[PDB]
Design a protein around this ligand. Structure first.
Ligand SMILES: CCn1ccc(-c2cc(-c3cnn(C)c3)cc([C@@H](C)NC(=O)c3cc(OCCN(C)C)ccc3C)c2)n1
Ligand SMILES: [Cl-]
Ligand SMILES: [Cl-]
Ligand SMILES: [Zn+2]
Ligand SMILES: [Zn+2]
Ligand SMILES: [Zn+2]
Ligand SMILES: [Zn+2]
Ligand SMILES: [Zn+2]
Ligand SMILES: [Zn+2]
Length: 311
């Protein structure tokens, strides 16, 4: 009989005492210590006085779990601890003043997303996600990477798409004040104006150029003809312009950061391009430098505050 603590958020700690013969699974349910499954393991001396993550089994823990993670999915904690057991072993070097990830288990898309998040203004709604966001920007990104995999329903080693990962994260972020007003002009139908909010207001799939998005882009109308969609008003701290991988010239000072993707569909490699005093390329732990750049780009991130068109 030795005393321990059980928690679901590492904030509210509940005091318990455990028997040595019975395993943790017989007494608490699925139990984790430092991200390691100890459901079948039995108590030792070092376990006394230490805190254990446990699956919610009563209503008090069920409520605390939602208030930290904003999910009731019973599998979330297990998927989170499974990813964390890998991400704790990864290395997170500082590259060009930013926290990156040494390559491991196909994490190239995580590194590009992690580098992008440190360069755009974002506030997460789940307290677990925002707290780990802060710890990650300071250099301790293991818990943050595990949460990203858990919220995106992705496992370690699985092949990830950066645009898809950013979209999942934006749905758990406060983008309520973000607003986008578009205008589509068809020769026959006429002029239609639409207003988008939230995640739909910051993401566009179709073109990398924020300038071309303002000047107008060609989309098919309901009548079948090719109408023209252009941006009327944009109120958001950033925008994300995505397009299928293609050769693109990035000029210093015209953008914030970008995602480079080489190789075949789903089984390629991501790289991160950021515009500082010059153009920097971050590939995990490796860093290169160039005055101008041209390569296969699929995401470009631009700064914004409030924009209104002249048309
Ligand atoms: C509308 C047309 N479009 C939209 C996206 C793309 C696209 C095309 C190509 C493309 C084509 N040829 N080559 C040679 C490469 C490549 C990509 C890039 C950005 N990502 C992945 O490769 C990828 C997709 C994944 O999951 C995807 C599964 N998802 C629907 C649940 C998972 C992991 C990765 C790496 C994206 N084209
Ligand atoms: Cl929610
Ligand atoms: Cl949320
Ligand atoms: Zn409590
Ligand atoms: Zn929420
Ligand atoms: Zn691993
Ligand atoms: Zn591992
Ligand atoms: Zn990779
Ligand atoms: Zn029309």
């Amino acid at each position: 009989t030795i005393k321990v603590f059980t928690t679901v958020d590492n904030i509210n700690l509940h005091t318990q005492v455990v028997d040595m013969s019975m395993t943790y699974g017989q007494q608490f349910g699925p139990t984790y210590l430092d991200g390691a499954d100890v459901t079948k393991i039995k108590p030792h001396n070092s376990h006394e006085g230490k805190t254990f993550y446990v699956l919610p089994n009563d209503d008090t823990l069920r409520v605390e779990a939602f208030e930290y993670y904003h999910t009731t999915d019973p599998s979330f904690l297990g998927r989170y601890m499974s990813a964390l057991n890998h991400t704790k072993k990864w290395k997170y070097p500082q590259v060009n003043g930013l926290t990156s990830i040494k390559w491991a288990d196909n994490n190239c898309y995580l590194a590009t997303a992690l580098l992008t998040l440190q360069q755009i203004e974002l506030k997460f709604n789940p307290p677990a996600l925002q707290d780990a966001y802060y710890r990650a920007r300071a250099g301790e990104a293991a818990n943050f990477c595990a949460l990203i995999l858990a919220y995106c329903n992705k496992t370690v080693g699985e092949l990830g798409d950066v645009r898809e990962t950013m979209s999942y994260l934006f749905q758990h972020a406060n983008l309520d004040s973000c607003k986008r007003v578009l205008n589509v002009v068809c020769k026959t139908c006429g002029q239609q104006q639409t207003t988008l909010k939230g995640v739909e207001a910051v993401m566009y799939m179709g073109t990398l150029s924020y300038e071309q998005f303002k000047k107008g882009v060609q989309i098919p109308c309901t009548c079948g003809k090719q109408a023209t969609k252009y941006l009327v008003q944009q109120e958001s701290p950033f925008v994300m312009m995505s397009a299928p991988p293609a050769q693109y010239e990035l000029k210093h000072g015209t953008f914030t950061c970008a995602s480079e993707y080489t190789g075949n569909y789903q089984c390629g490699h991501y790289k991160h391009i950021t515009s500082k005093e010059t153009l920097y390329c971050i590939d995990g732990a490796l860093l290169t430098k160039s005055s101008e750049y041209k390569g296969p780009i699929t995401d470009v991130f631009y700064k914004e505050n409030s924009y209104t068109t002249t048309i």
